[PDB]
Amino acid sequence: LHKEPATLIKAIDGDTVKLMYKGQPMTFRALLVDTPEFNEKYGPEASAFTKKMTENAKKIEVEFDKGQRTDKYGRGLAYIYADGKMTNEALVRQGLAKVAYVYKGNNTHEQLLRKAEAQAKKEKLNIWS
Numbered sequence: 001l002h003k004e005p006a007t008l009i010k011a012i013d014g015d016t017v018k019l020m021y022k023g024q025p026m027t028f029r030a031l032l033v034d035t036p037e038f039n040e041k042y043g044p045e046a047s048a049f050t051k052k053m054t055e056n057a058k059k060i061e062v063e064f065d066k067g068q069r070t071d072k073y074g075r076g077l078a079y080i081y082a083d084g085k086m087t088n089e090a091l092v093r094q095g096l097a098k099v100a101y102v103y104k105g106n107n108t109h110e111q112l113l114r115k116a117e118a119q120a121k122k123e124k125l126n127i128w129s
Protein backbone atom coordinates (compact mmCIF):
# COMPACT_ATOMS: atom_id res chain seq x y z
CA LEU A 1 0.00 0.00 0.00
CA HIS A 2 1.07 3.61 -0.13
CA LYS A 3 0.37 6.96 1.38
CA GLU A 4 -1.12 9.81 -0.65
CA PRO A 5 -1.42 13.44 0.38
CA ALA A 6 -4.61 15.05 1.68
CA THR A 7 -5.46 18.15 3.76
CA LEU A 8 -7.87 18.39 6.66
CA ILE A 9 -11.10 20.17 5.75
CA LYS A 10 -12.89 19.26 9.04
CA ALA A 11 -12.78 16.59 11.78
CA ILE A 12 -16.31 15.12 11.97
CA ASP A 13 -16.29 12.46 14.69
CA GLY A 14 -14.13 9.66 16.03
CA ASP A 15 -13.83 7.70 12.80
CA THR A 16 -14.84 10.13 10.00
CA VAL A 17 -12.99 13.16 8.72
CA LYS A 18 -13.62 15.52 5.80
CA LEU A 19 -10.44 15.76 3.75
CA MET A 20 -9.44 17.29 0.49
CA TYR A 21 -8.07 14.51 -1.66
CA LYS A 22 -6.72 15.06 -5.18
CA GLY A 23 -8.28 18.52 -4.92
CA GLN A 24 -11.84 17.35 -4.07
CA PRO A 25 -13.65 17.40 -0.71
CA MET A 26 -14.54 13.82 0.44
CA THR A 27 -15.67 12.35 3.80
CA PHE A 28 -13.29 9.57 4.78
CA ARG A 29 -14.29 6.63 7.03
CA ALA A 30 -11.29 5.05 8.92
CA LEU A 31 -10.81 1.43 7.89
CA LEU A 32 -11.05 -1.46 10.36
CA VAL A 33 -12.35 0.55 13.31
CA ASP A 34 -15.47 1.56 15.13
CA THR A 35 -15.60 4.58 17.41
CA PRO A 36 -18.78 5.17 19.46
CA GLU A 37 -21.25 7.79 18.02
CA PHE A 38 -20.99 11.19 19.58
CA ASN A 39 -24.08 10.57 21.66
CA GLU A 40 -22.60 7.25 23.04
CA LYS A 41 -20.20 6.79 26.04
CA TYR A 42 -16.64 7.76 24.89
CA GLY A 43 -18.15 9.11 21.69
CA PRO A 44 -17.19 12.64 22.67
CA GLU A 45 -13.68 11.50 23.85
CA ALA A 46 -13.28 9.70 20.50
CA SER A 47 -14.24 12.82 18.47
CA ALA A 48 -11.88 14.98 20.46
CA PHE A 49 -9.03 12.51 20.05
CA THR A 50 -9.31 12.40 16.21
CA LYS A 51 -10.03 16.20 15.98
CA LYS A 52 -6.82 16.95 17.90
CA MET A 53 -4.75 14.41 16.06
CA THR A 54 -5.74 15.64 12.62
CA GLU A 55 -5.90 19.36 13.35
CA ASN A 56 -2.43 19.30 14.98
CA ALA A 57 -0.80 17.37 12.15
CA LYS A 58 1.54 19.10 9.82
CA LYS A 59 0.81 16.45 7.26
CA ILE A 60 -2.24 14.25 6.67
CA GLU A 61 -1.99 11.23 4.38
CA VAL A 62 -4.50 8.59 3.19
CA GLU A 63 -3.72 5.02 2.40
CA PHE A 64 -6.20 2.90 0.55
CA ASP A 65 -6.26 -0.84 0.95
CA LYS A 66 -6.29 -3.36 -1.92
CA GLY A 67 -10.13 -3.56 -2.22
CA GLN A 68 -13.12 -1.18 -2.18
CA ARG A 69 -12.04 2.54 -1.92
CA THR A 70 -15.53 4.08 -1.31
CA ASP A 71 -18.33 2.74 0.86
CA LYS A 72 -22.03 2.58 -0.05
CA TYR A 73 -22.44 6.09 1.42
CA GLY A 74 -19.78 7.58 -0.91
CA ARG A 75 -17.29 7.74 1.98
CA GLY A 76 -13.66 7.03 1.24
CA LEU A 77 -12.22 4.06 3.02
CA ALA A 78 -8.64 4.41 4.16
CA TYR A 79 -5.94 4.32 6.72
CA ILE A 80 -5.46 7.88 7.79
CA TYR A 81 -2.01 9.10 8.96
CA ALA A 82 -1.11 12.25 10.91
CA ASP A 83 2.60 13.16 10.80
CA GLY A 84 3.31 9.51 10.01
CA LYS A 85 1.12 8.07 12.86
CA MET A 86 -1.95 6.03 11.89
CA THR A 87 -5.10 7.44 13.40
CA ASN A 88 -6.90 4.14 13.04
CA GLU A 89 -4.23 2.34 15.16
CA ALA A 90 -3.99 5.18 17.72
CA LEU A 91 -7.73 5.18 18.36
CA VAL A 92 -7.66 1.43 18.97
CA ARG A 93 -4.50 1.67 21.10
CA GLN A 94 -6.23 4.19 23.46
CA GLY A 95 -9.42 2.10 23.69
CA LEU A 96 -11.41 4.79 21.82
CA ALA A 97 -12.30 2.41 19.04
CA LYS A 98 -12.92 -1.32 18.63
CA VAL A 99 -11.48 -3.31 15.65
CA ALA A 100 -14.54 -3.75 13.45
CA TYR A 101 -15.80 -3.95 9.87
CA VAL A 102 -13.10 -6.32 8.80
CA TYR A 103 -13.97 -7.24 5.18
CA LYS A 104 -11.68 -9.46 3.03
CA GLY A 105 -9.46 -7.66 0.55
CA ASN A 106 -9.66 -4.56 2.72
CA ASN A 107 -7.89 -5.86 5.80
CA THR A 108 -4.13 -5.27 5.35
CA HIS A 109 -3.58 -3.74 8.84
CA GLU A 110 -5.95 -6.06 10.80
CA GLN A 111 -3.48 -7.75 12.99
CA LEU A 112 -1.47 -4.54 13.75
CA LEU A 113 -4.78 -3.07 15.04
CA ARG A 114 -5.78 -6.25 16.86
CA LYS A 115 -2.35 -6.16 18.56
CA ALA A 116 -3.17 -2.53 19.64
CA GLU A 117 -6.67 -3.55 20.88
CA ALA A 118 -5.29 -6.37 23.00
CA GLN A 119 -2.93 -3.81 24.74
CA ALA A 120 -5.78 -1.30 25.25
CA LYS A 121 -7.88 -4.14 26.73
CA LYS A 122 -4.99 -5.33 28.97
CA GLU A 123 -4.64 -1.72 30.17
CA LYS A 124 -8.43 -1.62 30.71
CA LEU A 125 -8.59 1.65 28.71
CA ASN A 126 -11.69 3.81 28.19
CA ILE A 127 -14.02 1.46 26.30
CA TRP A 128 -12.45 -1.50 28.26
CA SER A 129 -13.46 -0.52 31.79
Ligand SMILES: Cc1cn([C@H]2C[C@H](OP(=O)(O)O)[C@@H](COP(=O)(O)O)O2)c(=O)[nH]c1=O
Pocket residue numbers: 029030031032033034071072077101103
Ligand atom coordinates in the same frame (compact mmCIF):
# COMPACT_ATOMS: atom_id res chain seq x y z
C1 LIG B 1 -15.82 0.79 8.06
C2 LIG B 1 -16.77 0.44 6.95
C3 LIG B 1 -18.15 0.73 7.05
N1 LIG B 1 -18.99 0.39 6.02
C4 LIG B 1 -20.45 0.62 6.12
C5 LIG B 1 -20.99 -0.67 6.75
C6 LIG B 1 -21.98 -0.18 7.78
O1 LIG B 1 -23.26 -0.26 7.09
P1 LIG B 1 -24.63 0.20 7.76
O2 LIG B 1 -24.58 1.71 7.62
O3 LIG B 1 -25.57 -0.39 6.76
O4 LIG B 1 -24.80 -0.15 9.21
C7 LIG B 1 -21.64 1.30 8.07
C8 LIG B 1 -20.97 1.66 9.41
O5 LIG B 1 -20.40 2.95 9.35
P2 LIG B 1 -20.46 3.76 10.70
O6 LIG B 1 -19.83 2.81 11.69
O7 LIG B 1 -19.70 5.02 10.31
O8 LIG B 1 -21.91 4.00 10.74
O9 LIG B 1 -20.71 1.64 7.15
C9 LIG B 1 -18.43 -0.28 4.88
O10 LIG B 1 -19.19 -0.59 3.93
N2 LIG B 1 -17.09 -0.53 4.72
C10 LIG B 1 -16.27 -0.26 5.73
O11 LIG B 1 -15.07 -0.53 5.55
Ligand SMILES: [Ca+2]
Pocket residue numbers: 015034035036037
Ligand atom coordinates in the same frame (compact mmCIF):
# COMPACT_ATOMS: atom_id res chain seq x y z
CA1 LIG C 1 -18.95 4.86 14.44
